[PDB]
Structure formats: C-alpha cells, structure tokens
Amino acid sequence: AIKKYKPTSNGRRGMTTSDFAEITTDKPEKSLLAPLHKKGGRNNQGKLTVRHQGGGHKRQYRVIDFKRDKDGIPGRVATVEYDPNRSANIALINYADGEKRYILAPKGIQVGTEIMSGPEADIKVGNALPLINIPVGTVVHNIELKPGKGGQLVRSAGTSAQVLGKEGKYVLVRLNSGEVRMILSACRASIGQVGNEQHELINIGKAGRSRWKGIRPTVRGSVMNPNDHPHGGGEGRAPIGRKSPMSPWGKPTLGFKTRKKKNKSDKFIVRR
Amino acid sequence: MKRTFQPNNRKRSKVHGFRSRMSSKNGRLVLARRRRKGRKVLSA
Amino acid sequence: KDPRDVLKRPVITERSADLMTEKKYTFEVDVRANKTEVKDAVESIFGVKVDKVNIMNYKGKSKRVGRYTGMTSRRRKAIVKLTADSKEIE
RNA sequence: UCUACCCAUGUCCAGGGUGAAGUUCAGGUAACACUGAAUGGAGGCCCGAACCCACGCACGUUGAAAAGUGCGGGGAUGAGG
RNA sequence: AUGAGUAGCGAAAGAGGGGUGAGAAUCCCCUCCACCGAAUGCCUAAGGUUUCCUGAGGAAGGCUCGUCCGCUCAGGGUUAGUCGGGACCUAAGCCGAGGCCGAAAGGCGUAGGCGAUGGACAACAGGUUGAUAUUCCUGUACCACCUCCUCACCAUUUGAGCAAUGGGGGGACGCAGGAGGAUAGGGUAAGCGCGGUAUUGGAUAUCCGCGUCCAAGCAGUUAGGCUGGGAAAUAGGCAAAUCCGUUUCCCAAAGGCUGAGCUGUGAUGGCGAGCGCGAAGUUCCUGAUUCCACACUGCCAAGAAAAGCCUCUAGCGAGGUGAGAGGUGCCCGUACCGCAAACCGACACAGGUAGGCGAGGAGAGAAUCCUAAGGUGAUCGAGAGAACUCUCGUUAAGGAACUCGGCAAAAUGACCCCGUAACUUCGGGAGAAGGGGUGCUCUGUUAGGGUGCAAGCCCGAGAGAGCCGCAGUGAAUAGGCCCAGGCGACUGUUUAGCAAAAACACAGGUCUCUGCGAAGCCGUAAGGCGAAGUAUAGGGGCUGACGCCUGCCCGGU
RNA sequence: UGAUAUUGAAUGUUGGUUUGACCUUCUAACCCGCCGCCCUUAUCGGGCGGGGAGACAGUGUCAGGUGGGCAGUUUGA
C-alpha cells in the first residue's frame, strides 16, 4: 500500500509514499502519448490569473478514452501505469481489432481482465454502459453529463458514485461530494470505484516535493501590505481586522456561496 | 559589478527595430516624429 | 548582363604577385556576383580554363579627413586558380 | 539587454565521508517480532574547492570602485546555480 | 583665479650591459632574477568593428617621459561542397488569409508560416606567410547530384523500376548510484638513439641532459549491449496494406540492430631530439571528470516535438536498377581582443563577463606550496627610513581586569588508535567531549595486494630494533570546545545599495467555496489560465514539523 | 433582483372588463466549450443532419439594493 520512510533527516522525516505495487511497468505507449508545456498560471494574454502554480517536473500527456465510444469490441487489459497528470493510475488495454487505449484504473482490477463498453455488456468492473442499462445500487466513475462528450466527473482517485433511481429520460445519481443530481440517461459511465484509493493518505514530508509537483508557495494575506490584500497591514502580527475573512479581490470566503443563483442546472440538482 | 546594458544586437533589432516599429501604429508614429525632426538614425 | 560588367579590376600586391607565380590570379568584383559567374566570366573573356575559385568580401574601412569620417566602399575579391594546361594573362 | 516571476531548450556542481530502505546469511521466533554481520546505495544528509550568496570586522568613504577590496563566513545533488 | 606646485599619479621585482636615436629609468636585443600556473595559460561565444600586419610620425591621447602603441598617417591583410548558419526539422513564443469580438484604433485566433538555446547532417594530418587557414599547398578521403559515356542485370502493362505533402516504425530522451571495458593523458620504470663525462672535494659508465609518434577514410575484429523468433487469420491504423498493431499455432538458441575501441593499411610518406639535413621512435606501470552509455540497476518528482532515415501500400510507371569513368557543388561568417588596456562599468577603472582543454611532486583532491608547457614583470620614479594612518610579525609577568558585548586577534585544525555523556522523534546528539601516536635508517623489493606467462613495475597495514633534533600532519591549508536558556521545528527565501531576523515560506492541520461552459481570476467582449484536470481535484482564508490539547459565549457584526 | 423587447403555440386557473396574470405542456425563436458529415490535410467558424435545453437563459434599455473592489475629495480656528 504505502511506505513510511524512516527519519534519516528532518525533511525525510514524516514522509510517506505509495508502494506502486499495483503498477506493472515503467514505460508508456508512444502512440498514445502527447506533449505538454507548463503554463505558470498565465494566460493567452500573458498575465497571471491563478496563483500557486508553476515550476514542476515536466510531464507528457497520456491520451485517454473518457468516452468508451467503442462497443461490441472485447478488450483485454495489458498494463497498469502511472500518470503524473492525475491522482489515479491508468490501464492500457488492447482490443481485438489491434487498437490500443488508455483508461482509468478501478480498484480490484488485474491484467488479463476483459472489458466491454456497449449497452448489452455486463455490469462487472471496468466495463462501461449507459445509465439506463446500468441498474440501481452500483458504483460508477468517468460519468458524462452529455452523450459523446466523455466523462467530466468522478474520474479522480478513490472516488465513486452511487445510483439511486430514474425518471425516464433522466437518472438520479449520487456524487462523491455527497450530492444528488439528475443526469441524462443515455449518457455513459464506467463501473467501479477508482483504483488508487490511498492518494489522500500521504505525508508529502517537505516543500521540495510539492515544488516537484509544481506548486508554488502560498503567501498569507495578513502579512502583505494593504495595497496588495485587505488583511495586509497592521503594526505587528494582527488579526483579520474586518467583518469577514476576505479574498485578495475583496470578496469573502467563509460560507459565502459563490454559485450563481440564476443558474440552470439548479433544476437538475436536488441537494448537496 | 553587473550593469544594465548587456548588448545583444538581436534583442535590439527585434525590439527597437524597423520591422517592429512598422508593425504597430504607435511605432509608425515614432518614425513620423523621428523624421520631421530630421534624425539621421531613425531606428536601429 | 555581361562578364565585363561582372568583373571590376585586379589587385596588384606582392601577394598577388606571389600567387600569379603559382598560376592563381585575383580580382575584385561587384558585390552581388558569385563564384560561377566569375568563373564563366574569365573563361569567356580570356579563353582560359579554371581549376577552382576562392572568394572573399571585405568591409569598408572607416577613414578621416578633417572633421569628416566617412567609410570606404566594400570589396569582393576573388582568387581564381587556373589549371595547368591553361593559358596565362598579361 | 538590469531586476521579480514564468515558459522552452541546454549546461555546471573537485574530492572525501556517513550509511537508510531493500536483499542474503546467522542467531532468534510456532510464525513472527526482534538481534548481529555482508551487500546495497537513499538523503531539500555531512565536511569542503569551483560556483553562488553576503554576517563579522577592518579599510576605503572628492574612493581602484556611484556599493568594492582584504581576512575570515553560509550553502555547496537540490525548493540548486 | 584661490586651494597649490598641494592631494593623487589606480594592487604586483626588477637589475645590468649593448643598441637606436637630437634626446632614454620608461623603446628594442641579450643575460640573470621574480610572479601566474583549474591561471594572469591554450581554444571559443556574445559584443566590439580594423583595434590585426608592415613602414613612417610623436601635435593631441598615454595620469610622467617616450625614439614607443590598442594614438595619427599611408599601404596591406580575412580564400570553405564537409567548420557555424542558410537553400533541412521543429519547441516556447511571435505573425496570422478567412473568421470571432470590439466606439474607431485594434484584440483574439484556425489553416499556414517564422522561430535554436535543441534534433539531423559528408574531412583529417602535416606544412605554410609578417598578418589567413580542420578555408591555402601537399597527400589521402567522404557526401549529394548529373550523364555526352563504359560495363553487369532486369522489364516494357503482372509492366521492371520509383517513392505519398497519407499510414506505421524509429528518431525519442529523466535523476542518482556503482561495477566493468577502452582511450586521451601521465610516469619516466625499463630498453633504444643523440650529445656530454665536467674542474669547487669526488665520480667511466653503476653518471647528466634531451627525445623515445602519427590520424580521417577503407577492410577485418571486438569488450559488450540491447532484442525473443518463424507460419497463418484479422471489426482498428480517416481511402487501401505484404508494413504496424491484435489473436492462435511451431521453435528456442540462432538471428538481426548495434557497438567504444582494437589489428593492418593509410605510412616507399609525414613528424621528430638535434643540427636546408635528420637517429631512435618499442615495452611496462598508472589511468580518467572522457567514450561504450542513461548501457545496467534502483527511484520517483515519471522524464519535448518535428523532420531527416526505414517500411507500407496508394499512386507514377516506358525504360529502369546497380557499379565504374568523367563532371558539378551556391550565399553569409572566417582578421584581431575575448577574466581583457579592444566587451559591459564615463577612464588604458583592483569590478562583472557563458562554455571546451587543463600537466608534474607531495597530495583524497581542480585544495594548498613550488614548478612545467606557455605567459608576464603591470604606464611615474629615487631616497630618507620621522610623527601619524593602514596592512603585517613578535613580545616579559598577568592573563578578559578592556569592553555595551571576548568585537577583533590569538588558540584549535590533517591522518591513525582508544574512548565518547544528558537527551531523543531511537535516526541522531557525535568529528561530542576527552586521551594517545605521527619524522629518518635497517630488518625489507615485507605480511600482503593489483598487473604480468614469468621476470619486471605500481600500492604498502603493521610491528621489531635503532638515529637525530626544542620541536617529526616539523613549511602553507584544513573544527575551538562545553553547560544552560529564549524564539523559530528543520533545509530554504527576503528589504539589489543599512536591517538575515524571532520576519516570509515550508511539510502538516483546519474552515469554507465549487457539479464542470465549474468556482476563482484576466479581459469591454471574444478568447483564455484553472485543466488538455473533475470533490482523494482546484481556489481562497487562518495556523504552522512532531507530542498532549485546543475550554465558555451565536447577545452584536 | 425586477419590468420591458427579442419572445410564440397551446390546456387549464382565477380577476374586472374580450382581457390580462399564474401554473403546466410543446416547438419553430434563441443557446450548446455535445455527436456525425462536408467546406477541410484544421480541437477556429459555418452549412447540413441529429440530440439536449427552451421563450428560460443571454444580450440591450430602465429601476432598486449591495458595493473602500475602485476613484475624487473633506477632515476649522
């Protein structure tokens, strides 16, 4: 599962990692790789728009079939692989037509396991289906909000979503946020809790490791100057000094629901 | 000590250069100003 | 276009002397021309063959006359190596 | 073209030391646990040159210098230069 | 003008003899001496733009002089199919037809194209002038292309052959560690050659000095490294398929890709001590920071693209393929400086300036001291040797009484052996502290190891005897240590140019937001970061490792 | 946040005089950083076909609230 390093040094002290036991290999498929270049939080305009990003180890994108458009084609798992671009792991699978793809990595999955993605398929792990053919009481991921678009949902590691019922064209679904939602029924989804399941259970141990992950430091606003942040200023270390904690851009943070009120998906959602 | 001016003719010609000034409106206006005065060296 | 317009004039130095002893002559040329042009120019003018050509181009020396500090014109000098079994030149 | 940050691609870090994880052996245990060696070679690890930075002093303070020099100093395979 | 002929004349060893010249500390030559030597040496960028070389000159500049030059005048000097860059590739980024937005201007952005700091790519070894040279000359080669030609083969419609701007492969990749192999290089250890055997006492050999090589390409070979192969069938590889990929069968070492280097050639030449000529030109040892090579192993933070190349068919296909012979091969740059007096610092400025090579002894070492190769003697001097200032060295007895304060300085310092505490997150503390020993000779070419076929070269623990000194890491360099406390867990970052910190950050913790066209943020908007991510994620706030904990109040905001 | 224009077709409902308002529903408007095909070797857009949402949203005009996020200013003798 995880490793717990010994305290040979104050930086290595407290550190934990994964054993990467689930992994099988150390090299991906060139056919499915693609390039990246970091962005440092900057935009088209060059201006910085998001903080706390930039300067990590470089990476190379692993293309993914979040759609499972292929149907009636039995695939077979070949490998499990590391993707730096995500909490989860991935699985390289090979279809009978010679095509090869990556997918997300559920838990309890092994090499040699076979896969089908079409509606008539079975409801075991790794397979993919529309929510109609999927029954109630199932654990699901890479859920898609629109048919053909691919999963824009539970993809992350250790995550899972439960199914609850139907309304015909729409389907009730629980989400890892704890949230209930109506989703169009023809939209596909893939079965099984996502694999890694312990990514959260890590002590990064030091700062350099987050820098390697590409996270730049975070400066608190209570030490900035008032030109820069509201909390900034004050002779000596000082408290907030106003009605609420506030953002650098003059908005509150705690409790202030940011979602739009006139939004339309409010119809489809139920609770949270 | 290290100082401000570290010459690179490429950077000079790609910033303060003729193609660049002619690229933009405001750079054209320079050349206008920089002619009716009568400057021999109107740009890099 | 004409070879007569290609070539401009020779270069008379002790270097050029030493070289015409060794059958390879020199010239100076319009700045745009090239090696093959000058080769065919020589062949067409003097009726002589060529072993090879080696070509150069110098910048303009700055000068001074009173306050005035202009620059000399540029130059494109070209060394040509006649074959053996080839003619010489005046 | 300084400088702050970022992006892409390159490049530099004399030597020496410590000795982790893991593996094997032996003791040990019902099994383990645990213990001792060998291998192993980690580390924002150690000492310390290049390199980088600037704490302590002195000097200079119409200077060699519009921010330095000298003697020491800190980091020196990582948040590196 | 004064200040005042005052300050300063910008780190650093020079002296003498000759010469030149109207005129010499300052220019040239010689001899000695001294400095550098992981640099003050060789290459080379950016940048400078003639400063290069030669010959004249000394009005200015040179912090003086000047017969001199990075100054002034004249002249001259930079030679490329293979080097670097273009007629090749693309990243970041930039431009951007059409288009999308926008009071205008313009912004965004597709196709497409620019764009190296990377990829790919054919030539080396010797001379050469005052100045260029893997560019010129001499030798030997290689790459691409062309056919007036020669040869061999194949075929003209199943018609041999060619290779898509398409597909596939490959290019194509991190970081660390360590063994191996080889080589540059080094040693002079042998052996060889050349020269000398000297005058200060001594030495014919048991001596001294100097030198003891040669590519690219071609043929062969290899340490090794990788890679499992063969036969059929194919829901895919935007059209197709003998190529890919997938599956099933038969074999299990062979095969292929590679491969540093090595041997012969190249070499009936060149180089070469030394004197236009020219001897020996081998072996042994050591041995990389370099190559095999990111090859292997391990690790996680999971390590560019495209084109060259190969292949597939599609398509073109009536003359082609191969070899030889002959022939063609453009543009830019090439001088010179490049830790410097030519660059950036207003200066001939004690500063800064990327990268490659980088010797010997002692040495772990690019440290350090002294020296090689090679380069310098530094742009004012001589002369007295006082107060004072600076940088240094010694010091009686005392020993921190000085002092805000042991600031500064001194002291310690290397290697080996013994020994090493409270405490602890059990890892450390710890080089704790503290003690002790180091030199030379003989046993001894040692016990022993590496190499070697052996001889013969390298490394060299330990003890025994002995010898000297005040003193044996005899010089330079290389911890001062301990007790306790506060603050911050730590490594790190910061007020360039007063403040390095208890400040910032940090990993960790917690709260909150956000269901994906997220949220937030930039922008008038389009368009974007977020994210080619999806609540084990992203953003914001506060707190700051770890351990024990984090109590009462929701009245007010 | 509301009114109004884009923004129309219905079934009901309740009001006073047909009318407007309200709830449901539909689609053709509008929208889609959903799919497929062509433009086209194109992750732009733009045409077709579907699909999803839907007279909502978005946008324009008007109005109220909040609003040191920002600006101009005052803060006596």
Side-chain angles (χ1 to χ4, degrees):
Chain A
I2 57 172
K3 287 175 68 62
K4 187 179 265 72
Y5 289 108
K6 289 182 182 174
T8 63
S9 69
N10 287 326
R12 178 67 67 185
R13 189 181 291 275
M15 187 186 290
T16 62
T17 61
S18 68
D19 195 0
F20 299 112
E22 66 276 18
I23 304 297
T24 62
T25 63
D26 58 355
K27 65 185 291 298
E29 185 64 25
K30 289 171 88 288
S31 297
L32 298 173
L33 291 175
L36 288 176
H37 67 280
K38 302 186 288 294
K39 297 183 177 69
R42 276 74 170 175
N43 62 359
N44 57 4
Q45 190 173 3
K47 288 170 73 74
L48 184 150
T49 64
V50 68
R51 301 188 298 172
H52 303 166
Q53 293 188 355
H57 197 285
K58 70 184 286 185
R59 296 176 182 172
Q60 200 172 7
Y61 183 71
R62 274 70 165 171
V63 176
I64 304 296
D65 188 356
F66 293 116
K67 295 184 184 180
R68 304 295 192 90
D69 57 356
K70 189 180 284 292
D71 291 327
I73 304 299
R76 183 181 295 280
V77 177
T79 61
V80 174
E81 290 181 354
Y82 184 80
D83 191 358
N85 293 309
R86 59 186 71 260
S87 64
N89 291 317
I90 57 176
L92 196 156
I93 66 96
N94 300 325
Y95 293 109
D97 61 357
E99 184 172 358
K100 296 187 175 174
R101 291 181 187 271
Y102 280 143
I103 57 166
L104 295 167
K107 68 187 291 297
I109 194 171
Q110 284 78 240
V111 178
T113 302
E114 287 184 353
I115 298 297
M116 183 62 72
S117 295
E120 66 275 16
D122 57 355
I123 62 89
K124 65 183 288 296
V125 177
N127 293 318
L129 290 172
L131 300 172
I132 300 165
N133 297 113
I134 291 166
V136 180
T138 62
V139 295
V140 182
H141 63 284
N142 71 10
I143 301 163
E144 68 186 1
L145 296 173
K146 296 178 180 177
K149 188 175 181 182
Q152 288 75 239
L153 293 172
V154 171
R155 289 166 56 172
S156 177
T159 66
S160 65
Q162 182 63 261
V163 176
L164 295 171
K166 296 187 283 290
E167 289 81 2
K169 188 170 72 172
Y170 292 103
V171 177
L172 296 174
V173 176
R174 181 176 290 169
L175 297 174
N176 193 2
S177 63
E179 175 166 355
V180 176
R181 187 182 172 85
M182 288 178 68
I183 294 167
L184 193 145
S185 70
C187 287
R188 289 181 185 274
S190 72
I191 292 164
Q193 183 175 4
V194 182
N196 197 353
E197 185 61 26
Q198 63 186 357
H199 183 73
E200 63 186 1
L201 296 173
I202 291 166
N203 184 0
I204 293 161
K206 70 182 186 177
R209 192 173 173 191
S210 64
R211 299 280 287 166
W212 298 345
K213 289 186 181 177
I215 295 166
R216 291 192 66 242
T218 298
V219 174
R220 298 176 290 114
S222 293
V223 300
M224 300 188 181
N225 303 121
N227 57 356
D228 296 330
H229 194 276
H231 298 173
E235 289 293 329
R237 184 179 288 161
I240 300 302
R242 63 189 298 166
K243 297 188 287 292
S244 63
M246 289 184 72
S247 67
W249 298 279
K251 278 75 172 176
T253 61
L254 273 67
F256 181 66
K257 291 175 182 176
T258 311
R259 185 180 176 83
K260 291 176 90 290
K261 303 293 179 69
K262 195 178 284 294
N263 195 359
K264 60 179 72 174
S265 66
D266 297 332
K267 183 173 85 275
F268 295 107
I269 64 95
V270 176
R271 66 178 67 256
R272 60 182 62 83
Chain B
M1 297 300 294
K2 182 174 172 65
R3 302 294 184 192
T4 65
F5 182 65
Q6 300 295 323
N8 191 352
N9 294 311
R10 184 171 178 177
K11 287 171 69 70
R12 185 167 182 274
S13 296
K14 193 174 285 291
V15 174
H16 306 296
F18 183 77
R19 303 288 288 163
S20 178
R21 297 283 174 78
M22 188 61 69
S23 66
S24 68
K25 178 178 77 68
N26 293 312
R28 268 82 66 77
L29 298 177
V30 169
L31 300 172
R33 291 197 296 274
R34 179 57 65 98
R35 280 168 179 163
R36 60 177 174 76
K37 184 181 278 283
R39 288 283 175 79
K40 185 181 286 295
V41 174
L42 80 170
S43 71
Chain C
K1 186 174 175 65
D2 289 330
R4 306 289 181 177
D5 292 330
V6 170
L7 292 175
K8 192 178 288 298
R9 62 185 184 271
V11 178
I12 299 91
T13 64
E14 65 275 19
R15 292 288 297 269
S16 67
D18 295 332
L19 294 169
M20 63 180 68
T21 57
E22 297 294 328
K23 294 292 294 301
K24 59 178 75 174
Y25 298 164
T26 190
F27 292 98
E28 56 183 357
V29 184
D30 57 353
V31 178
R32 293 186 297 278
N34 68 359
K35 193 175 282 186
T36 67
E37 282 176 353
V38 59
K39 186 178 179 181
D40 187 75
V42 172
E43 290 178 353
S44 66
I45 291 162
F46 298 99
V48 188
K49 295 184 291 299
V50 173
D51 189 75
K52 64 183 286 187
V53 178
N54 301 115
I55 194 167
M56 301 168 66
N57 50 2
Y58 287 169
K59 299 191 287 292
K61 289 186 180 184
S62 177
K63 293 183 75 66
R64 189 267 301 166
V65 178
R67 282 83 63 195
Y68 303 105
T69 54
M71 189 177 288
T72 303
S73 64
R74 296 178 292 168
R75 289 184 290 119
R76 185 172 182 82
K77 68 192 288 291
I79 304 95
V80 300
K81 187 177 180 179
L82 303 175
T83 68
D85 297 331
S86 294
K87 289 173 89 290
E88 295 82 0
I89 297 170
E90 61 87 19

